Amino acid sequence: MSLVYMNIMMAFTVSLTGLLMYRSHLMSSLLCLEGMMLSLFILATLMILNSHFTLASMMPIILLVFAACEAALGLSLLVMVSNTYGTDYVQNLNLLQC
Amino acid sequence: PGIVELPSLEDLKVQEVKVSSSVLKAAAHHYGAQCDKPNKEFMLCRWEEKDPRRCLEEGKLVNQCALEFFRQIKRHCAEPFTEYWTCIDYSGLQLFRRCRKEQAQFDKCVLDKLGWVRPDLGELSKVTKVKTDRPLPENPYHSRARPEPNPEVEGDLKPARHGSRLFFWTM
Amino acid sequence: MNPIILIIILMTVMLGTIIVMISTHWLLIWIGFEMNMLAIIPIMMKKHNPRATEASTKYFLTQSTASMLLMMAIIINLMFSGQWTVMKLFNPMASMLMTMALAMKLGMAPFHFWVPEVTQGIPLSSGLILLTWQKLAPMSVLYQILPSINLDLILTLSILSITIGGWGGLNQTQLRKIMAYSSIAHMGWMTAVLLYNPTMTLLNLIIYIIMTSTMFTLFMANSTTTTLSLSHTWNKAPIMTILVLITLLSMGGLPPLSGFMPKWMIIQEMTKNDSIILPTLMAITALLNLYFYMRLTYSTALTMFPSTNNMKMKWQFPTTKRMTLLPTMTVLSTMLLPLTPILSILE
Amino acid sequence: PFFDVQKKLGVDLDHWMTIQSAEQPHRIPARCHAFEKEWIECAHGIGSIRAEKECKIEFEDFRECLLRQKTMKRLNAIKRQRDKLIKEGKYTPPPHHSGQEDLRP
Amino acid sequence: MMTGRQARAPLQFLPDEARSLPPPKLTDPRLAYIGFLGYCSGLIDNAIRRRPVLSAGLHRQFLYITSFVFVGYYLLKRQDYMYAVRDHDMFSYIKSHPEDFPEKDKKTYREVFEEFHPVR
Amino acid sequence: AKTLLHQYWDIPEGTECHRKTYAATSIGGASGLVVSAYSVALKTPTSFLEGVARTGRYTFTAAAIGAIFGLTSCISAQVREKPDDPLNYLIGGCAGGLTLGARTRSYGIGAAACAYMGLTAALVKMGQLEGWKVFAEPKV
Amino acid sequence: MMTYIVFILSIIFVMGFVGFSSKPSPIYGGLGLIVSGGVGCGIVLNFGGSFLGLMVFLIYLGGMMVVFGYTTAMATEQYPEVWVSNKVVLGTFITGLLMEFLMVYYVLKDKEVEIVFKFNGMGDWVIYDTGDSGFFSEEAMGIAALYSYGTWLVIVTGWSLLIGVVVIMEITRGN
Amino acid sequence: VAAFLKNVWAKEPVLVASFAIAGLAVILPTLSPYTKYSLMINRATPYNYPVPLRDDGNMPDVPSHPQDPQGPSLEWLKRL
Amino acid sequence: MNLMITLLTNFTLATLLVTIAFWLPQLNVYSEKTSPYECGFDPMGSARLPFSMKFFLVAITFLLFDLEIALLLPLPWASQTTNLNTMLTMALLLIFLLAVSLAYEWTQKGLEWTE
Ligand SMILES: CCCCCCCCCCCCCCCCCC(=O)OC[C@H](COP(=O)([O-])OC[C@H](O)COP(=O)([O-])OC[C@H](COC(=O)CCCCCCCCCCCCCCCCC)OC(=O)CCCCCCCCCCCCCCCCC)OC(=O)CCCCCCCCCCCCCCCCC
C-alpha cells in the first residue's frame, strides 16, 4: 500500500511501545494513549479521505471525541493517584500485590 | 488479466470549445436552453454506459453543438456578450449579481435578434426525458454469473427423532 | 454514591454492553466498549480508598490499551475490506490485534495480570460486575469474528489461561483473588471451545455467570472477603456453609452438579474435531481449580474453625441484606445437570 | 450474542455507515463503489464459506481498488525501467511528457 | 452451528414453525424436575432467611414453583424446536446430497472375515 | 519459529546427527530466550549485567538441553537401527532431564526431569507417528 | 521532492512520536505531541480534510494545555528530563530516530518495503482522485451528515459525554 | 409561578434569559409556517447533476426540455 | 504552497529578531544577574515544586466541553440538509445535553474551586 501508511502505522507502534513500557511516571504514558488516538485518527482519516467514503468522514470526529472522553477519565484518575501520594509515580500503585 | 482497450489519438481529435470559463458561465443559461438535446443524450449515455470510451461520439455531438451555439452568438450579438463576459470575468467568484445590466442588455439583444428565452430560476435543474435510439446496456458493470444460493427450508417440521440424542437423554 | 447517579451509571454499563451486542458497525462496538469502561470506573471507586484507586488505574490502563488495539484492528479491517460490518475480519493482522484486544478485555493469560489486582481492590459487588457483566461484550465480539480467529492463538490463550488460572488460586487466601484466578481458568475453558462449537462457549459463559454470581452473593450475604473470615460462617449462618459447599463443589466440575455440564460438553465438542490431547490437558489442569475450591470447602463447611466471642452478639441479629436471587442461583448452579440438553436453546 | 435488535425492531441504527455502497449524502460515490457493489451482490446470501472462494475474484478487484497495490507495483516497474533507460541514455522522453505539448481542451 | 438458520428471523424465541411441533405436556418429567427446582428454591429461600423451611411462606414457595414451571415450559418448547430444526436440516442435507451418502451394502457374517484372537 | 520445528522434523531419524543436534539446539535456544524475556520482564534484575547473565544462563541451559536431547536421540536411532521408535526419544528426554539437573546442580530435579521429559518426548514421537493433533483444525 | 510532501510531514510526525514516546517529561511530551498533531493536520489536510485536520489540531491544543496544567500541578519533579538528561530517554530517542530514518533509507532506495504489510516507496500523490467534487467538499458533507444520518451516533456520543462529566465528578470526590 | 419568576429574575437574570431563549428555540420552529420553506429550499438547491431519464414512452410528468411547462417549478421561491 | 511560504517568512523574521537581539548588544555575564527573581531576595526552593491546581475539575471538564465544538461545529453545514427536522432535533439534543452537563456540574459544586 501507499507510503504514508507506513509512517502512520510506525507512529502507532512507537506510541504503543511508549505506552507499553512505563518510565515510572503516569502522565508521560497518558500522553502515549493520546498519541495512539492521534495516530488512529490520522490513519483512519487518510483511509476515509482517500477512498471518498464520505459518510465515514464523521467517524474520526467521533473517534477523537472518545479520545478525550477517556483522556479526561485518565486525568480524573491521575489526580486521585496524586492526592493519595505526592507524585503520580506508577510504582506507588503496588498495594494490590499481596 | 487482459489488455485495456483505449481509443487512438485520431479517435479523440475534435474541434474544442477554446473559450475561457467566464465566457462559458456568461453564456451558460442559454447554452442549457438551446443545447439541451445532445447534452442530455450525452449525459444519459454517460450515466448508462458508465464508460467514457463508449460515449465519445455523443460527446463529439456536444462539441459540435456548443460551437454552433457560440457562432450564432458571434454572428449576431458579439459585442453585448463580449461586454457581459468581460464583466463576469472581472470578479473572483464570478458573480451573476454584480453584472445585471450587461445581463439585461445581452438577454434583450439575444431575445430580439435570435429569439431565445433565458431559463428561469428552477428550470435547468429539471430531470428531463431523452429519446435515444441506442440500446439500453444489458450489463454496464461487465459483471458475471452470480453464484447459486443455498437451498431454502421446506416441508413440515416433524419432531426430533428420539428426542435430543445427547448420550442418554431419551427426551 | 447518590443512588440516582448509581442507577444512571449502572444503566450506562448495561448500555455499553448492549451497544456491543446489538450493533452491526465496528465503530459502535468500540463506542460500546468505551462507554462500558467509562461508566464502570466509578463503580470500582465506590468506596474511595487507595486500593480502589489503584485497581481503577490498572483497569483503565489495561482496558484503554485493549481499546487502542481494537480500534487499530478496526482500521486495518477498514483498509483491507473498505467496510465496517461486524463479521469476520479480512486480514490476519487485524485478526491478531482484535484477538489480543479481546483477550486483554477478558483478562485471559498472559494478559491476566490485572484481574486478581483489580478484583481484590474493589468491593464484592463491583467485583461481581467485573467478573460477570464485563465478560459479555468481548465474548460477543469473539462470537462474531470466529471465521477469522487464528486457531493457534485462541488455543494458546485458552490453555495458558487454564494453566495460569489453575496455579494462581492455589497460593491465595483472599476470596476475590480466588474468584479472579477462577475467572481466568474459566475464560480459558470458554475460548478453547470457541472455534469448535460457540454454543458451548455461550453455555460455559452462562453456567459460569450463574456460579460466580452465586459465590459473590454468598460472600456479600456473609460479609466475608478472606478465607479465614468465611471460615466463621458455621457459627453464624450454617446454611450458608452448605450453599458454599455445593457451589464450590459445582465450580470444580464435579458430577452430578451443573458445573460439570460445560466442561464435559466442551470435551464433547473437542473430541469430535479429533483433538484428544488438548481437552485432556484442560480437564487434568482443572483439578487445580478443584483443589483450591476444596480448600475453601474444608475451611468453611467440612470442618469448624475456631470462632470468637463477639459472634455471640451476631446470633441475635438476622440478615437484613438483599440476597437477590440467591436461592434461585444456588439451585441453578447445583441441580441443573439433568437439564443438560437445554443448551440447544443457545444455538 | 448478536442480539439483532435492529432487524427485529426494523430500526436503522448503524447500517448506513456500514459499507461504501450505501446511501450517501448528495449521492457522492466512493472510488470503489462498483467493485464493492459487485462483491456484495456476489457474496449475498451464499454464506461466508462459499463467499471466500466463489467470490474471490470480485473481492480481489475490490481490494486492489482500495489499496491499489498492483497498480502501484506496475507503476514502480514502469518508472524504474524509465529511470534506468534515462540513466543508460537509451531512451528520451517525448515532448508531451516534458510540457511543450499544447494540452487538449 | 445453526446460527445461519436463525438469521433471516432474528430474536424469535419461538418461530411460527415451532407451532407445527407438539408442545411439552404439563406432566413432562423435565417440567416436573423444573418445578422441583422451584420448590427447592423456595426451601433454600426459607432456609437462608431463617424461616421455618416447610411451613413459612407457602405463597412464596408456590410462586417459586409457578415461576419455574412457567419459564421451563417455554424453555422446553425452544429446546424441542431446536432439536427438530437440527433433524430437519440433517435429513434435508442428506436428501439433497445423495453422492455424499452412499447406500451401504451390509454384508452378512458369512462373507465378513474377522480375525479370531484367542484368550488362552 | 514454526520453521525451526519444521527443519527439525524434516530430517530422517538416525541419518545426520549434527544437523539434528543443531536444530534442537536452536529450538532450545528460542525457548530459553522466551523464558529469559519473561524473566527479565516480570522480575527486575538488579543490573544490566545481571539481566544478561540470567538471559545467557537460561538460554545456555535450554540450548544444552536441546543439544543433548537431539544428540542422544539421533545416536540412539543410529545404534539401535529403529528410527520410528519412541524409546529413542525416551532416552533423549531422560538425557535432557539429566542435562537440566546438571544445570540446576541437583540430582532430584535431574531424575524428575528425566522421567517427565522422557515421557513427554516419547508422547511427541508417538504424536508424530500416529498424527496426533494438539491444535486440531475444526472439522465438524 | 515536493511531491513527497505528505511523506516528509509524516517523517516529522514519526519524529514527534519518538519525541514524546521516549517520555522525557510531560512538558516535552506535550511539546512533541503538539508538533506531531500539528504536522498531522498537514498530512491529512493534503488529502482534502481541511475541516478534519484543523479539529485534530485544535482539540489537541486544548488537550495539551490541560495536560500542561496537570504536569505542572501533579506530574512535576525538581529536575525535569529535557530530552537528554536520562540515558534511557536519549538512548531510545536515538534508537527510534535511527530506525525511522533506516526505514526511510530502505524505502527510497528500493521503492518498496515490507514491515508487516508491504508498502510502496513512490510519493503518495499517486493515489489521489483525478476528478472534482463540484460545489461541495465531500468530507464537510460527511461530517454534516452526523445530524441527518448519524442520529444514533449523536445519542450515544452525547450520552457518553454527559456521563463522562458525571463519572469524572464522581471520581474526583474522595468521599 | 409569577413570584418565583420574579425571584429568579431578581437573583439570576442571565439564567432566566437563557431558559427563555432556549424555550423559544425549542417550541417556536414547531409553531412557524416558514419551517416548511426551509426544507423546500434545501431540497431545491441543485448540487448534483439532474441525470436525465430514458424516454420509454409513457412519462407525462417528465419534460423533454427545461423550458417545458411540466416538471417541478420554483415560483414559490421567487414570490415568497 | 503559499501558506508554507508565509509561515516560513513569519518564523524567519520572528527568529531573526531574536538572533539580532542576543548577538548585537554587549554581553556582561556574571552569576548574580542571571539568578531568578524573588523581588530581590533569593528564592526559597525551586519553582519546579508541584503548584497545586485548584481549578482541576473545571480543567478536566474543559476537555469534554471542547469536544462539543467538534460536534456542534458542522451546524452551518448541517443546516443545508434535506432531512432538516431530524437535524434540528439532533442539534438541540446536543446543546441540551451540554446544558444538562453544565447544570449537573453547577449544582454538584463542580465549578467552584477547592480550598
Ligand atoms: C390424564 C392426563 C394426566 C396424566 C398424569 C399422569 C402422570 C402423573 C404424574 C406426573 C408428574 C411426573 C412424575 C414423574 C414421571 C416419571 C419420571 C421418572 O421417574 O423418570 C425416570 C427416569 C428415566 O427412567 P426410565 O426407566 O428410562 O423411564 C421411566 C419413565 O418412563 C421415564 O419417562 P420419560 O422417557 O418421559 O422421561 C424423560 C427423561 C428420561 O430420563 C432420561 O432420559 C435419563 C436421564 C435423566 C437425567 C439424568 C441426570 C444424571 C445426572 C444428575 C443426577 C442428579 C442426582 C440424582 C438424584 C438425587 C436426588 C435429588 O427424563 C428427563 O429428561 C427428566 C430428568 C429426570 C427428572 C424426572 C422427573 C422428576 C420429578 C420429581 C423430581 C424429584 C427429584 C428427582 C431427582 C432429581 C434429579 C433428576 O429415571 C431417571 O432418570 C433416574 C432418576 C429417577 C427419576 C425421578 C423420580 C421421580 C419420582 C420421585 C419421587 C421421590 C422424590 C423424593 C424427594 C426428592 C429427591 C430427594
Atom of ligand 1 lying closest to residue E29 CA: 69
Residue among D77, C141, G161, D22 nearest I60 (CA): G161
Cβ neighbours of residue B126 closer than 8 Å, sequence gap 6 or more? H50, H63, H66, H71, H72
Question: CB atoms < 10 A from the CB of E96, how many?
Answer: 10
CA distance F135 to A3: 38
Test G149 with D25 for CB contact under 8 angstroms: yes
> Which residues are within 8 A (CB) of G131 and not within 5 positions of it... i.e. 6 or more apart?
none
> Are H42 and I82 a contacting pair at CB < 8 A?
yes
Q: Chains A, D: CB contacts under 8 A, how many?
A: 31
Distance (Å, whole) CA C121 – CA A94: 11
Count CB neighbours of D22 within 10 A. 16
Domain spans, chain E: 1-97
Question: C76, exposed or middle or buried, with CB in 10 Å at 0-12, 13-18, 19+?
Answer: buried
Query: Is the Cβ–Cβ distance between I65 and A69 less than 8 Å?
Result: no
Q: 3-state class of D61 per DSSP?
A: helix
> Is residue E36 within 6 Å of ligand 1 at its C-beta?
yes
Q: Which of D14, D63, D67 to mutate to test the interface with A (most CBs of A within 10 A)?
A: D67
Q: The domain spanning residue A3 has which CATH number? A: 1.10.287.3510
Residue from C204, C182, C210 nearest C279 by CA: C204
Please give the C-alpha separations between residue F138 and each of B165, C274, C276, D50, in angstroms, as whole numbers: 22, 8, 13, 17
Q: Does A76 touch chain I (CB under 8 A)?
A: yes
Distance in angstroms (rounded) separating the CA atoms of residues B89 and B25:
9
Cα angle vertex G95, ends G41, A29, to 5°? 60
Torsion angle (degrees, nearest 10) of CA I65, I71, I72, I77: 160
**Residue for cell digits 536515538?**
G94
CA of B142: which chain D residue's CA is closest?
D38
The DSSP secondary-structure symbol of D92 reads -
In angstroms, rounded to a whole number, what is the distance separating the alpha carbons of residues C44 and G114?
44
CB C108 within 8 A of CB C187: yes
Question: All 3 cell numbers of residue D103?
Answer: 494540452
**Residues sharing a CB contact under 8 Å with residue H79, sequence separation 6 or more, in sequence order:** none
Q: Which of C160, C253, C164 is nearest to C204 (CA)?
A: C253
Are the C-beta atoms of A82 and G75 separated by less than 8 Å? Answer: yes
Residues of A in contact with D31 (CB under 8 A): 50-52
Q: How far apart are CA F123 and CA C191, in angstroms?
A: 26
Whether there are 3 or more C-beta pairs closer than 8 Å between G and B is: no
| Other residues' Cβ atoms within 10 Å of the Cβ of residue B15 | 10
Cell of I46: 525551586
Angle at A89 between CA A87 and CA A92, to 5 degrees: 95
Joined grid coordinates for residue A91: 510504582
Q: How far is the CA of E38 from the centre of ligand 1 (A)?
A: 15
Would you call D62 exposed, middle or buried from its count of C-beta atoms within 10 A (0-12, 13-18, 19+)? buried
Q: What is the CA radius of gyration of chain I?
A: 25
Residues F40 and F55 sit within 8 Å (Cβ to Cβ)? yes
Under DSSP, the state recorded for D97 is: G
For the CA atoms of F39, F42, F48, F50, what is the dihedral angle to 10 degrees? -50
All three cell numbers of I88, joined, read 434540528
**Residue A42 maps to a domain:** yes
Unique residue bearing C-alpha cell 464484592: C124
Cell of I99: 446544558
| Interface probe with A: pick from I66, I67, I68, I69, most Cβ of A within 10 Å | I67
- CB atoms under 10 Å from CB of G150, counted, come to 25
> How far is the C-alpha of D60 from the C-alpha of D71, rounded, in Å?
13
Q: For chains A and E, tell me whether 3 or more CB atom pairs sit within 8 A of each other.
A: no
| Domain with A29 in it | 1-86
Contact state of A55 with D68 under an 8 Å Cβ cutoff:
no
How many whole angstroms separate alpha carbon C312 and alpha carbon E16?
A: 61
Residue B8 CB–ligand 1 contact under 6 Å = no
Taking CB atoms and an 8 Å cutoff, what residues of chain D touch C79? 66-67
Number of domains present in the structure of chain A: 1
B166 strand-pairing partners: B169
Q: What angle do CA E10, E13, E18 make, to 5 degrees?
A: 100
CA distance D12 to D7: 8
Q: Which residue's CA lies nearest to atom 92 of ligand 1?
A: E33
Burial of F107: CB neighbours in 10 Å, binned 0-12, 13-18, 19+: exposed
Entry resolution in angstroms? 2.9
Which of C9, C27, C48 is nearest residue G173 as measured by Cβ atoms? C48
Q: How far apart are CA C232 and CA C237, in angstroms?
A: 9
* SS3 assignment for chain C: CCHHHHHHHHHHHHHHHHHHHHCCEHHHHHHHHHHHHHHHHHHHCCCCCHHHHHHHHHHHHHHHHHHHHHHHHHHHHHHHHCCCECCCCCCHHHHHHHHHHHHHHHCCCCCCCCHHHHHHHCCHHHHHHHHHHHHCHHHHHHHHCCCCCCHHHHHHHHHHHHHHHHHHHHHCCEHHHHHHHHHHHHHHHHHHCCCCCHHHHHHHHHHHHHHHHHHHHHHHHHCCCEHHHHCCHHHCCHHHHHHHHHHHHHHCCCCCCCCHHHHHHHHHHHCCCCCCHHHHHHHHHHHHHHHHHHHHHHHHHHCCCCCCCCHHHHCCCCCCCCCCCHHHHHHHHHCCHHHHHHHHHHC
Whether there are 3 or more C-beta pairs closer than 8 Å between B and E is: yes
Distance from chain centroid for Cα E111: 42
Tell me if A93 is assigned to some domain. Answer: no
Question: Could you give the CA distance from residue F99 to residue F94 in angstroms, rounded to a whole number?
Answer: 8
Nearest to B57 by CA among B73, B69, B45: B45
Q: How many domains does chain G have?
A: 1
CA distance F82 to F76: 8
Q: Which three cell numbers stand for residue F137?
A: 483444525
SS3 G115: strand
Tell me the residue ranges of DSSP E strands in chain G.
Answer: 112-115, 117-120
d(Cα C56, Cα C63) in Å, to the nearest integer?
10
Q: How far apart are CA B74 and CA B86, in angstroms?
A: 15
Q: Which three cell numbers stand for residue F27?
A: 529450538
C338 alpha carbon – ligand 1 mean position (Å) = 9
C-alpha cell at B46: 454517460
Name the amino acid, one letter, at C342: I
* DSSP of B52-75: GGGSHHHHHHHHHHHHHHHHHHHH
State the angle between helix axes of A26-51 and G26-43 in degrees (0 to 180), rounded to the nearest 10.
0
